[PDB]
C-alpha cells in the first residue's frame, strides 16, 4: 500500500507573480529542476501547459518539445485554429526515465517567415498562463532498514521542505535526556541548514512519520517493552508495529550517561554506522574548539580564497548564448562593525570569451539584487580590485557577478538574408580570487536580538556551545521541550557544527558564579504582563536570574560576569509556546525582530528597546 | 556449436553520454560503435529502434537509413500516420558484413517544405529513443590452440567490457606463488588498461571460462594430476577437460623460483611465443629503470609533443560541417610540484579552414570542462598559458572549434539552395608542452594519488622498493584483493611489477627502505595508536574527525582542518572496508596504504570497490570507509612531505 502525496512543481524560470515568462527566439528554455528523496518513487507524472502563441507564426513549422531527461517524450504542434486563443495541453510522462535529479525542459522552435527571418524579433513569442507545471504523485517504499544510509530515512540532503521528524521520550525527561535530545537536535539542524528544522516531542505515543525514540533501560515507552535490557547503548532502526513503512531510530542506554554517549556518537561517529543494532562503547573529545570557528561562517584567521564558498565545482562557470549570473553565497560573523570602513578588497581575476568588436558588453556586481558597479569587457583576463561596502553582517549574502553581452553581428547585411548559428560564449571566475576578513575586531552591541535572530550570535560564539548554560524548569511539559529542541536546532543550523559540549541544567540554583551565556528556556512569566506592563516583566526576569499568552524574548546582560548575554524566552500557555515555536521556526517574522524585548501577539511583533546597551570585546 | 551467449546492449550503454541523439539537418550523422572478440561469430543480430520524427517533414521524402560499415542500406520512410508519433521499428541486420569493429550509422533526411527550404533549420528533426539498441547473439568458436596469438584467447584487446580471468591455484600458496600470480595480474592489467581488471581466485575448483593455472610439480590443481613431471618451467596451453571450447593456461615448474621465472618470461618475453609448451629457461635483466618512468605517464626529461600523447592515429584531426572537439588525454604524475609556478607554457600549431568572412569563429581550450582560452579563427606556434591550479592526475585538454559559417539565403524574391560544405581542422602534431621545469615535492599523507595513479607504490614502475605484507595462508578473498590491487597499480602505469617482492611476516620490514602495503591483518609493529585513524579487528572500529569538513579545499594543507578532535569507536555486525594511508615509522620518508576488511562481505565490498574505477575515483583524504552506501572519505591525521624541494 503505502501513502502517496501530490506535487505541483511550477516553472523554475517563472517570471515574478505580477509578470509572466515568455519563450522567444533567443531564450527557448523552460527548465524545471527537481530531485528525488531516495525513498519515494514517481508512480504518475503529468504535465499541464496553458499557453498562448503568437498569431503570426506558422502552425506546423512551430511546436513545443518536452524533454524529461534528454529523452523528448512528446512534441506538441500548433494548428491554424489553435494559434490565437489560449490552449491547454496535457501530456503524460512515464517515470521510467526519472533519475535522482531531473531537469524537464521545454524547447520552443520559432518560424514566422520563410524567405527571410531575423532572430530576436517581437512578432514571435509564446506566453504561458502560470498554470503550467508538472503534477507528480510521490509514493513511498519500504527501505531495506540499514543504518549505513544514515540519516537517509529521516533526513536526506535533497528535500526543500521542513523535516518534522519527532523525538519521543517516555515522559518527564531528566537532565541527561534533555542534554542528549538537545545534542541530537543540534546535529540534525546543523546537517539540515536552510531547509527548515522542526523537532516535535511526544510522550509515550507513536507518531506517523519517521521518529526517534529515547529510552534509558528504565521508565521506557510501552512499544519498547519487547526489547531486552542491554548494558551498552545500542542505536537501532526498528519498524513501526502498525505500519512498517515508517522507521523509528531507537536509542537505548543503560543509564543517563549512556544516552549522552550515544548522542555524542551519533553527532560525531556517524560515518561508520553499519548494518543494524550499532552499539557505541567509547567516544571522547581530544582538542577543544576555538571562538568564531564555525564551519558555515567564513573564517577570520586567514583570507578566503573563493574556493571554499562553492559547494560544487561548476558554480563559477557558465556556458551558453546568454551566460547566467554567477552567484556565490557567504555568511559572515556579526562582528565587522561599521564607522571605520577599512575596506574589503574583493579581488576578482576573471576570464571570459572576448567579443569580436567593441560592443560595450557589461559586467555588473550585485549584492542581493543591488547594482553596485559595472565594467566593460574588451581588450586578456580582467583583474578587478574593488571594495564592497554595506555588508549584511550575519545573514547569507550572495555576491552576484552578471556578465551581459549584447549579441554582436545582429544582421551584418540586409541586402542578403544571412542565416548563421549564434556562437555560445563561456565565462568563468578564477578560483584564485581573494576576499579579506583577516584583521577585524570583535566589537558589537550585545543586547540586540538582531544578531541572535539572524545567526544566534550570543550563544553560537563557541561552535560546541561550551560556555552556554540552558536553564529548564522542573518536570518540563511537551511544549517546553519542544521549544528547547527548536531553539537548539535553530542555533545549530545558523552555525555549521553540532553542539557536542552543550550542558543543560534543570534548576537555577547551580548558575551563580559561572562564565557562560545563560539561556532560560523555561518561561512561566509572572502574570503581570500586559500592553502597558513591559518593564515589569524585565524586572521579574532579573529577579529570577538573580536566584493570548505573551512569548517574550528578553535580552539582558548577565549580572554575575558583565560579559555574557542572557536571552530568556518566556511563555506560559501552550498557545504562547506554539506561537514562540512558530516565530523561532518562521524566518520571515524572525528576521523582522529587533530591540531588547520581542513579544509576539496573535497578530503582531512588538520589538521594543529597553535597558542599557553594553559592548563586548577588547580594543 | 557451443554456448551461444545472448547480448542485449541498449543505446545508452555504448552511445554518447546523452544517449538519445537528435538527428537534424546540420548533424545528419551519429553512430553507435561496438567490437568483437575474434573468438566469436555473430548470429541473428536483430536491431530494434524507437524514433520520433518531426510533424513538419514530408512523409515520403523524409527517411532514416542505416549503414553497417557502409552496407545494409536498410531504409525506413516516414509514413503519414506516424508523422509526429513515437514509432518502434525493427531493422534486421545480416551478420555477413559484421567485422571485428562495427559502427552502425543512422542518417536522417527530411524536407519540411517542397517549393524551397532553408538549410540549418530547427523545424525538422528526428530523435531516436534511449531504450532502443542492437540485439546480437554471439557464438563461441574453437580456437586453433596456438600461443602465437597470446593473449587474445584469454583476453582480446579488441574488447570493451571488464575481462574476468580466474587464476586457479593448487591450494596453500607460498611466497613465490603469490609473487608470480601478482606479476601475471600486473601484466594483464597493464595490457588491459581502462577496460577494468578483475581476477577471481578459486582454490582447486574448475572455472567455466578461460583461466590461468599455476603448478610447481608438488602442489597440483588436482585436474592436472595425470601429467609427466616437468624438468624446466614450461607454459602449456590446453583446453578444459569437460568443455573443449574454453582454453586454459598451464604455468608449470619444479620450484617457486621456476614459476617466478616463467611469470617473468610471460611478462617480458611474450613476443616470441611459438605454438605451445613454450619452455622459458633464462630471463635475466641487463639494466634497471629510473623512477617516474611509466609508458602511460608524461615524460619529464624533455618537452613532450602531441605525437606521444595520441593513443590513436586520427585523434588530432576532425572534419565535418561542425567539427568535433579534439580532446587529448595526458596523465602526469601527482608528485609534480605546480603551485609555486604561475602556470605552464605550451605551444600549439592549429591548422584550420579560413572562413569566408570575419564571422568570429573561435577555438576554445577547455581543461576539465573549464574554459581556458579563446582564439579567433580570423586573426591569421602560438603560446598558451595553463594556470597549474586544477591539474590533477587524469586531466585532459579539449579544443573545440565553434564555427559560425554565413550561409547565403538570398533575397526575398529568390530562394537559392546551396550545397552544405564541410570543413576540417587539425590541432597539429608539432605542438609541444613543457613538463621538465617542475620538481617532485607534494604533501602526500593522503591516498587520492593511490586511487588515481598509485603514487607511493608506482614510483618505480617495476616496484623494486615495494614490499607487500600478506597474512599467513591467505584465503580466496585476500588473494583476490592482492591480485586486483596489484593489477590496478599496474594498469595505472604501463609496465608490469617485475621486481615486486611479497612478504608474509612482519619481522622483515625492520631495516628495509621500501614502501609497505598491508592487505590482510596488520602486524603488532604497526597500530601504534598514532597517525592511524581506523582499525578493524572485526570489532570496535574507531575514527577521528579532523575538527572540520570542507567540500573542496585548496592545494595547500592546513593545520586546523586536519587535526584530530574526537575518537568515535563503534562496533556492529555489519561489514566495512578501511583504507588508511599513513607514514611508515621505519624510515620516515615512505608511506603505508593498508586496506583491510573484517568479514567475507567486507572483502567482497573492498574488491568490488578497488575493481571498478567509478566508485574508486570518489576516494580522497587520508581515511576512507567503504560501506553499502558507497564510500565516505575524510582527511584526518598529521601531514608529511615526500621528495626534495
- Count of Cβ atoms closer than 10 Å to residue A212 Cβ: 24
In three-state form (DSSP H/G/I as H, E/B as E, the rest C), the secondary structure along B505-555 is CCCCCCCCCCEEEECCCCCCCCCCCCCCCCCCCCCCEEECCCCCCCCCCCC
Asked if B130 lies within 8 A of A71 by C-beta distance, the reply is: yes
- Across the beta sheet with B630-634, the strand order is B501-503, B466-469, B515-518, B591-597, B577-583, B623-627, B630-634
Asked if A279 lies within 8 A of B565 by C-beta distance, the reply is: no
The DSSP symbol for B465 reads T
CB B214 within 8 A of CB B251: yes
What nine digits make up the cell of A487?
Answer: 531553539
Residue B355 in 3-state DSSP?
Answer: coil
CB A388 within 8 A of CB A419: no
Smallest CA-to-CA distance from A101 within A195, A6, A11, A36 is with: A36
Q: Which of B554, B629, B630, B631 is the mutation pick for testing A, counting most A CBs within 10 A?
A: B629
Q: If residue A567 lies in a helix (H) or strand (E), which one and from where to where?
A: strand A565-570
In three-state form (DSSP H/G/I as H, E/B as E, the rest C), the secondary structure along A8-50 is EECCCCCCCCCCCCEECCCCCCCCEEEECCCCEEEEEEEEEEE
CB B235 within 8 A of CB B280: yes
Asked if A280 lies within 8 A of B542 by C-beta distance, the reply is: no
In three-state form (DSSP H/G/I as H, E/B as E, the rest C), the secondary structure along B226-252 is CCCCCCCCEEECCEECCEEEEECEEEC
Smallest CA-to-CA distance from B525 within B540, B539, B505, B542 is with: B505
Q: Which residues does chain B have within 8 Å of residue A153's beta carbon, measured at their own beta carbons?
A: none
N- to C-terminal Cα separation, chain B: 64
CA distance A145 to A147: 7
What nine digits make up the cell of B414?
Answer: 529568390
Query: Considering only residues 526 to 585 of chain B, which have any Cβ-Cβ distance to chain A shorter than 8 Å?
Result: 540-545, 547-554, 560, 563-576
Residue A365 in 3-state DSSP?
Answer: strand
- A415 contacts chain B (CB < 8 A): yes
- A359 contacts chain B (CB < 8 A): no
- B379 contacts chain A (CB < 8 A): no
Cα distances from A577 to residues A339, A341, A569, A590, A602, in angstroms, run 39, 42, 10, 15, 12
Q: Show the beta-strand stretches assigned E in B111-233.
A: 125-128, 134-140, 163-164, 167-169, 197-198, 201-203, 212-214
Asked if A114 lies within 8 A of B112 by C-beta distance, the reply is: no
Smallest CA-to-CA distance from B367 within B328, B397, B329 is with: B397
What nine digits make up the cell of B502?
Answer: 611479497
Range A585-592 contact pairs with CB under 8 angstroms and sequence separation of 24 or more: A585/A162, A585/A196, A585/A197, A585/A198, A585/A486, A585/A490, A590/A453, A591/A395, A591/A453, A591/A454
Between A271, A275, A314, which is nearest B573 by CB?
Answer: A275
Around A358, how many Cα atoms within 13 Å sit in the side-chain half-sphere?
2
Range B406-409 contact pairs with CB under 8 angstroms and sequence separation of 24 or more: B406/A412, B406/A418, B406/A419, B406/A420, B406/B356, B406/B357, B406/B359, B407/A418, B407/A419, B407/A420, B407/B119, B407/B120, B408/A416, B408/A418, B409/A115, B409/A116, B409/A416, B409/A417, B409/A418, B409/A419, B409/B118
Residue of chain A whose Cα is closest to the Cα of B379 = A356
Q: Is the dihedral of CA B82, B85, B88, B93 positive or negative?
A: positive
CA distance A435 to A302: 10
Q: What angle do CA B57, B62, B63 make, to 5 degrees?
A: 135
CA distance B24 to B21: 10
Bridge partners of A163? A197
Burial class (CB in 10 A: 0-12, 13-18, 19+), A96: exposed
Residue B504 in 3-state DSSP?
Answer: coil
Smallest CA-to-CA distance from A568 within A587, A547, A589 is with: A547
Residue positions counted in chain B: 645
CB A541 within 8 A of CB A556: yes
Range A600-604 contact pairs with CB under 8 angstroms and sequence separation of 24 or more: A600/A550, A600/A551, A601/A548, A601/A550, A602/A548
Bridge partners of A569? A553
The DSSP symbol for A592 reads T
- A128 contacts chain B (CB < 8 A): no
CB A375 within 8 A of CB A382: yes
Query: The cell 515507552 sits on which residue?
Result: A221
Resolution limit in angstroms?
3.4
Burial track A97-129 (b if 16+ CB lie within 10 A, e otherwise): bbeeebebbbbbbbbbeeebbeeebeebbbbbe
| C-alpha gyration radius of chain A | 29
Residue of chain A whose Cα is closest to the Cα of B623 = A271
Q: Is the dihedral of CA A453, A454, A457, A462 positive or negative?
A: positive
CB A183 within 8 A of CB A260: yes
Burial track B401-437 (b if 16+ CB lie within 10 A, e otherwise): bbbbbbbebbeeeebeeeeeeebebebbeebbbebee
Helix residue ranges per DSSP H, B123-200: 175-192
Cα distances from A90 to residues A47, A106, A128, A133, in angstroms, run 6, 14, 14, 10
- A90 contacts chain B (CB < 8 A): no
Smallest CA-to-CA distance from B189 within B504, B626, B613, B615 is with: B613
Between A70, A74, A317, which is nearest B20 by CB?
Answer: A70
Asked if A282 lies within 8 A of B112 by C-beta distance, the reply is: no
CA distance A375 to A379: 13
Give how far B343 is from chain A: nearest CA, Å: 13
Burial class (CB in 10 A: 0-12, 13-18, 19+), A347: middle
What nine digits make up the cell of B595?
Answer: 586496506
Between B412, B551, B554, which is nearest A115 by CB?
Answer: B412
Cα distances from A357 to residues A227, B400, B401, B436, in angstroms, run 77, 21, 19, 39
Residue of chain B whose Cα is closest to the Cα of A63 = B123
Q: Which residues does chain A have within 8 Å of residue B119's beta carbon, measured at their own beta carbons?
A: 419
Burial class (CB in 10 A: 0-12, 13-18, 19+), A488: buried
Give how far A355 is from chain B: nearest CA, Å: 8
CA distance B456 to B555: 18
CA distance A28 to B23: 19
Asked if A419 lies within 8 A of B118 by C-beta distance, the reply is: yes
Cα distances from A578 to residues A172, A225, A599, in angstroms, run 19, 32, 13
Please report the DSSP string for A415-455 in residue order.
TTTEE-PPPPEEEEE-TT-BB--SS----EESS-HHHHHHH
CA distance B554 to A306: 10
* Maximum pairwise Cα distance, chain A: 92
CB B166 within 8 A of CB B131: no
Between A63, A148, A356, which is nearest B376 by CB?
Answer: A356
CA distance A445 to A614: 6
In chain A, how many H helices and how many E strands? Answer: 7, 34
Q: Which of B402, B416, B570, B626 is the mutation pick for testing A, counting most A CBs within 10 A?
A: B570
Smallest CA-to-CA distance from A293 within A501, A563, A495 is with: A495
Burial class (CB in 10 A: 0-12, 13-18, 19+), B174: middle
CB A466 within 8 A of CB A287: no
Residue of chain A whose Cα is closest to the Cα of B132 = A71
What nine digits make up the cell of A539?
Answer: 524586572
Please report the DSSP string for A477-539 in residue order.
-HHHHHHHHHHHHHHHHHSSS--TT-EEES-STT-TT--SEEEE------S---SS-SHHHHH
CA distance B605 to B326: 38
Residue positions counted in chain A: 619
Bridge partners of B566? A285
Helix residue ranges per DSSP H, B89-155: none
Query: Considering only residues 590 to 629 of chain B, which have any Cβ-Cβ distance to chain A shorter than 8 Å?
Result: 625, 627-629
Asked if B566 lies within 8 A of A269 by C-beta distance, the reply is: yes
Do the strands B249-251 and B212-214 form a parallel or antiparallel pair, or are they unpaired? parallel
Size of interface A-B (CB pairs under 8 A): 230
Query: Considering only residues 206 to 235 of chain A, which have any Cβ-Cβ distance to chain B shorter than 8 Å?
Result: none
In chain B, how many H helices and how many E strands? Answer: 7, 44
Do the strands A40-53 and A87-92 form a parallel or antiparallel pair, or are they unpaired? antiparallel
* Maximum pairwise Cα distance, chain B: 93
Amino acid at each position: 500500500n503505502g501513502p502517496s502525496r501530490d506535487v505541483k512543481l511550477t516553472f523554475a524560470q517563472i517570471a515574478p507573480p505580477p509578470g509572466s515568462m515568455v519563450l522567444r527566439g533567443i531564450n527557448p528554455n523552460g527548465s524545471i529542476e527537481f530531485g528525488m528523496r531516495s525513498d519515494e518513487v514517481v508512480t504518475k507524472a503529468m504535465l499541464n501547459l496553458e499557453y498562448t502563441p503568437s498569431p503570426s507564426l506558422l502552425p506546423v513549422q512551430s511546436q513545443l518539445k518536452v524533454y524529461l531527461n534528454d529523452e523528448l517524450m512528446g512534441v506538441l504542434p500548433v494548428t491554424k485554429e489553435q494559434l490565437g486563443k489560449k490552449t491547454l495541453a496535457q501530456m503524460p510522462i512515464n517515470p521510467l526515465f526519472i533519475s535522482d535529479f531531473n531537469r524537464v525542459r521545454l524547447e520552443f522552435v520559432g518560424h514566422y517567415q520563410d524567405v527571410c527571418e531575423k532572430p530576436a524579433s517581437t512578432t514571435l513569442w509564446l506566453d504561458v498562463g502560470r498554470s503550467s507545471g508538472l503534477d507528480l504523485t510521490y509514493q513511498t517504499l519500504n527501505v531495506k532498514n540499514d543504518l549505513s544510509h544514515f540519516p537517509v530515512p529521516f533526513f536526506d540532503p535533497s528535500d526543500n521542505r521542513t523535516n518534522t521528524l519527532p523525538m519521543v521520550f517516555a515522559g518527564a525527561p531528566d537532565v541527561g535526556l534533555q542534554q542528549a535530545s538537545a545534542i541530537v537536535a543540534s546535529w540534525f539542524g546543523s546537517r539540515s541548514g536552510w531547509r527548515g528544522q522542526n523537532f516535535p516531542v511526544l510522550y509515550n505515543q507513536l507518531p506517523d512519520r519517521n521518529a526517534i525514540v529515547f529510552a534509558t533501560n528504565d521508565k521506557r515507552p510501552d512499544f519498547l517493552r519487547d526489547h531486552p535490557a542491554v548494558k551498552a547503548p545500542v542505536i537501532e532502526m526498528i519498524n513501526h508495529p502498525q505500519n512498517p513503512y515508517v522507521k523509528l531510530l531507537v536509542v537505548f542506554g543503560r543509564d543517563d550517561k549512556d544516552l549522552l554517549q550515544a548522542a555524542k556518537g551519533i553527532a560525531q561517529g556517524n560515518i561508520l554506522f553499519r548494518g543494524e543494532s550499532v552499539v557505541v562503547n567509547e567516544v571522547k573529545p581530544l582538542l577543544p574548539r576555538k571562538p568564531y570557528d564555525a564551519p558555515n561562517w567564513v573564517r577570520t584567521d586567514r583570507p578566503v580564497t573563493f574556493g571554499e564558498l562553492k559547494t560544487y565545482e561548476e558554480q563559477l562557470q557558465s556556458s551558453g548564448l546568454e551566460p547566467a549570473a554567477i552567484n556565490v553565497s557567504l555568511n559572515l560573523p556579526p562582528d565587522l562593525y561599521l564607522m571605520r570602513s577599512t575596506g574589503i578588497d574583493m579581488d576578482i581575476n576573471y576570464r571570459y570569451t572576448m567579443p569580436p568588436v567593441k560592443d560595450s558588453s557589461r559586467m555588473d556586481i550585485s549584492l542581493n539584487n543591488q547594482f553596485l558597479q559595472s565594467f566593460n569587457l574588451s581588450s586578456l583576463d580582467g583583474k578587478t580590485d574593488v571594495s564592497i561596502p554595506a555588508l549584511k553582517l550575519g545573514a547569507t549574502n550572495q555576491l552576484r557577478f552578471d556578465f551581459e553581452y549584447m549579441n554582436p553581428m545582429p544582421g551584418g547585411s540586409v541586402d542578403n538574408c544571412i542565416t548563421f548559428q549564434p556562437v555560445q560564449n563561456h565565462v568563468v571566475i578564477g578560483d584564485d580570487s581573494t576576499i579579506d576578513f583577516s584583521k577585524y575586531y570583535h566589537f558589537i552591541p550585545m543586547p540586540d536580538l538582531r544578531a541572535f535572530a539572524n545567526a544566534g550570535f550570543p550563544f553560537s560564539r563557541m561552535a560546541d556551545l561550551s560556555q552556554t548554560i540552558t536553564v529548564m524548569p522542573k518536570a518540563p511539559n511537551e511544549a517546553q521541550m519542544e521549544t528547547l529542541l527548536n531553539t537548539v536546532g535553530f542555533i545549530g543550523a545558523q552555525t555549521g557544527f553540532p553542539a557536542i559540549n552543550l550542558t543543560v541544567t534543570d534548576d537555577g540554583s547551580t548558575i551563580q558564579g559561572k562564565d557562560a551565556d545563560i539561556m532560560i528556556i523555561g518561561g512561566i512569566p509572572d502574570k503581570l504582563k500586559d500592553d502597558k506592563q513591559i518593564d515589569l516583566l524585565v524586572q521579574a526576569t532579573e529577579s529570577w536570574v538573580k536566584t493570548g499568552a505573551m512569548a517574550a524574548v528578553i535580552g539582558f546582560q548577565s549580572p554575575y560576569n558583565d560579559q555574557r548575554s542572557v536571552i530568556a524566552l518566556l511563555a506560559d500557555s501552550p498557545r504562547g509556546y506554539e506561537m514562540l515555536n512558530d516565530a523561532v521556526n518562521d524566518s520571515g517574522k524572525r528576521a523582522t525582530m529587533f530591540g531588547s524585548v520581542a513579544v509576539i501577539r496573535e497578530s503582531g511583533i512588538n520589538s521594543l528597546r529597553v535597558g542599557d546597551v553594553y559592548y563586548v570585546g577588547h580594543l
